């Protein structure tokens, strides 16, 4: 059967996790998507000529119990850790999301990509060097994205799949 990559999108409210996921899946930019809604998406893609399925959980950081949330956090193969380049607080929050992933995976080596979203906006308060320095500290890729323009969106998800492939061949 076709290989499935189970991916989880995490980060502070308002960074564009839902917009990024819908851009990947539906190829349009959504201005308004309920900040409390957590849902999974499945998409067949070709990455470096490998036809595969992306099984993505768009997390919403809500209190209410979800069996699906626990399952994706436990069995997820890769995580997008998303901040917004015009939201210093969302960048300050990244370490908390990475710590949560390491604890649920019981691993120091979980495939992850650091995503700086909203790179279409001129009011950048988190610079490339700061983001590259954090990614280097974690030993993970840094990808700049815009859910609005689609800049870097395929690159973010496809880079995470390449990190998972590397982990599986370790």
Ligand X SMILES: Nc1nc2c(ncn2[C@@H]2O[C@H](COP(=O)(O)OP(=O)(O)O)[C@@H](O)[C@H]2O)c(=O)[nH]1
Q: Based on CB atoms, which residue is closest to Mg ion, 87 or 165?
A: 87
Q: List the 78-84 sheet strands across, edge first.
A: 39-47, 50-58, 4-10, 78-84, 112-117, 142-144
Residue 18 touches ligand X, criterion: CB under 6 A: yes
Among 141, 146, 156, 161, interactor with ligand X by CB under 6 A: 146
User: Is 78 annotated as belonging to a binding site?
Assistant: no
User: Is 76 annotated as belonging to a binding site?
Assistant: no
With CA atoms as reference, report the closest residue to 112 among 91, 81, 145: 81
CB of 161 to ligand X, least distance (A): 21
Q: Based on CB atoms, which residue is closest to ligand X, 134 or 153?
A: 153
Q: Which does 152 bind (CB under 5 to 8 A by kind): Mg ion, ligand X, none?
A: none
Among 43, 124, 148, 167, interactor with ligand X by CB under 6 A: 148
User: Is 36 annotated as belonging to a binding site?
Assistant: yes
- Beta carbons of 111 and 41 less than 8 angstroms apart: no
- Beta carbons of 53 and 3 less than 8 angstroms apart: yes
Residue 14 touches ligand X, criterion: CB under 6 A: yes
Q: How far apart are CA 65 and CA 147, in angstroms?
A: 28
104's CB contacts (< 8 A; 6+ apart) are 73, 74
Q: Which residues bind ligand X (CB under 6 A)?
A: 13-19, 31, 33, 35, 117-118, 120-121, 146-148
């Amino acid at each position: 059967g076709m290989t499935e990559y189970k991916l989880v999108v995490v980060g502070a409210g308002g960074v564009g996790k839902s917009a990024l996921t819908i851009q990947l899946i539906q190829n349009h930019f959504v201005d308004e998507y309920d900040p409390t809604i957590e849902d999974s998406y499945r998409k067949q893609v070709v990455i470096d000529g490998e036809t595969c399925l992306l099984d993505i959980l768009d997390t919403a950081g809500q209190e209410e119990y979800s069996a699906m949330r626990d399952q994706y956090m436990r069995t997820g193969e890769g995580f997008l850790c998303v901040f917004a380049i015009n939201n210093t607080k969302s960048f300050e929050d990244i370490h908390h999301y990475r710590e949560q992933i390491k604890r649920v995976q019981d691993s120091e080596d979980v495939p992850m990509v650091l995503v700086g979203n909203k790179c279409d906006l001129p009011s950048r308060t988190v610079d490339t060097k700061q983001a590259q320095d954090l990614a280097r500290s974690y030993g993970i890729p840094f990808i700049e994205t815009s859910a609005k323009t689609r800049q870097g969106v395929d690159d973010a998800f496809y880079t995470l799949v390449r990190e998972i492939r590397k982990h599986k061949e370790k």
